[PDB]
Amino acid sequence: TRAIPELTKLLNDEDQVVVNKAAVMVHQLSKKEASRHAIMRSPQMVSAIVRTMQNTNDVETARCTAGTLHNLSHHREGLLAIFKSGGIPALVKMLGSPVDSVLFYAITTLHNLLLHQEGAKMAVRLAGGLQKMVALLNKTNVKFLAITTDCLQILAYGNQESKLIILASGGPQALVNIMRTYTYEKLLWTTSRVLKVLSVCSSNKPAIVEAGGMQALGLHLTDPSQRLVQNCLWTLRNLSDAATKQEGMEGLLGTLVQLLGSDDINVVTCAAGILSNLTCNNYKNKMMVCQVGGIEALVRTVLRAGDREDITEPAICALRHLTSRHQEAEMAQNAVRLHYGLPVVVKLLHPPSHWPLIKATVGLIRNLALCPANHAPLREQGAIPRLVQLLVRAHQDTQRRQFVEGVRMEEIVEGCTGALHILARDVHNRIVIRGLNTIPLFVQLLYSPIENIQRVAAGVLCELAQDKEAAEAIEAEGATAPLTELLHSRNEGVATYAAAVLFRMSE
């Protein structure tokens, strides 16, 4: 009723000299508690502060006004006043200020609003705050960058449109540069959090990966800050499925294999997940992983994981990738046995294991079975019976009809038959397989419409048919009719195996 009303009138004065002088006193009063609260309680005052800030051409006035809002932003009533008085649009404009002071007041004020004022997120987005904040990432004050990147994290979290705007603005590039450039923990952390939120968007992934984000994030994997390390891993894992074709992952792969020995569950989980994706169809990555003891490191991880399928599934998939299609694939198949992985691998075929893990494990065993030295061990561990069980159970759900556990029982069918197909290259294994009354099922599978099933069914039958007894049993099971038809399949494998079974049955 004394200073406030008067200063308010002065702020709205037509003469700038009077305005500027008022801005200084107002700012001064905002530094004292009693008068700060008085200012935030005057709608007309706050409104005059905001208008003056976004209209004045006096750097000193712009500093005192922004400084005033900054001081008011420490209280709920201040934050509310700023919000209701068109504060957001004004503050966003100030982010274009060439003055550091003004810029710092503005970003701090906006940050406080985004953190504690409901409705601020939308307002900032609406005012085009995302674009300016991203444009400010080329500044060099690390504390400033930390607050700015934190604003982006708040605005992008769970909001797809904000994520795309950050992308269109050149966000990925700028954020990766931060990771590759500074050492200030708080900035690296907040920045890794923005990249994490952006890595969830399938459209942001390419931009981040091409900018060298995998390497930039890889750089901090051994930092003392656990929150920094973990956020980099979450991000790297989200990106991994989009970086399977990237060159130069050798350094990262070494670190990742080392991280598999971490005591931190979240670290190991991400290390395994990233490794599985990076070893997907990339012979170079597979070789590098084998080179640094990846096989042993993964076997140890699986054993340590126990029933934690978040770890075993990606670790088992990695091992599956590593035991196939590359120079060291066979040595890898052999090494799994040497590092005592066969027992646990077979164990994973049983409960509490869920289908996703079951499918990956069957795949790995199919690969391991390619190494003759694993035949006896796998048999000794009870692989065959269980593989048959999964096949029977899976085959039934197929005919009695889709995704179960997120897995199609048709995949289990050819996966198990495919595994039994290879294990059947061993005499003793053939005795066990036939001893389980499987032939009738295999012959049945020849009628499947899925060529892959046909092929693996014809395959096991062919291996089995090398023994006279089994051959006559197959023949006696009525395999001749279906095989004669598959003999004419345009599928090389189907026709070849089919002819082979027929030939064997007539020796």
């Binding site: 953190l115 708080k186 989200n238 169809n281």
Partner: protein, 40 residues
Amino acid sequence: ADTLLHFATESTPDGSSLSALSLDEPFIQKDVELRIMPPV
């Protein structure tokens, strides 16, 4: 062929706050409620 595992973890386990900017202003304590209540 090898298969990809599609990860998209955005919300991360919650588990020193950001250091204030260097400005010529008196330190001001933020409303108690703004420090005991999570972000909006």
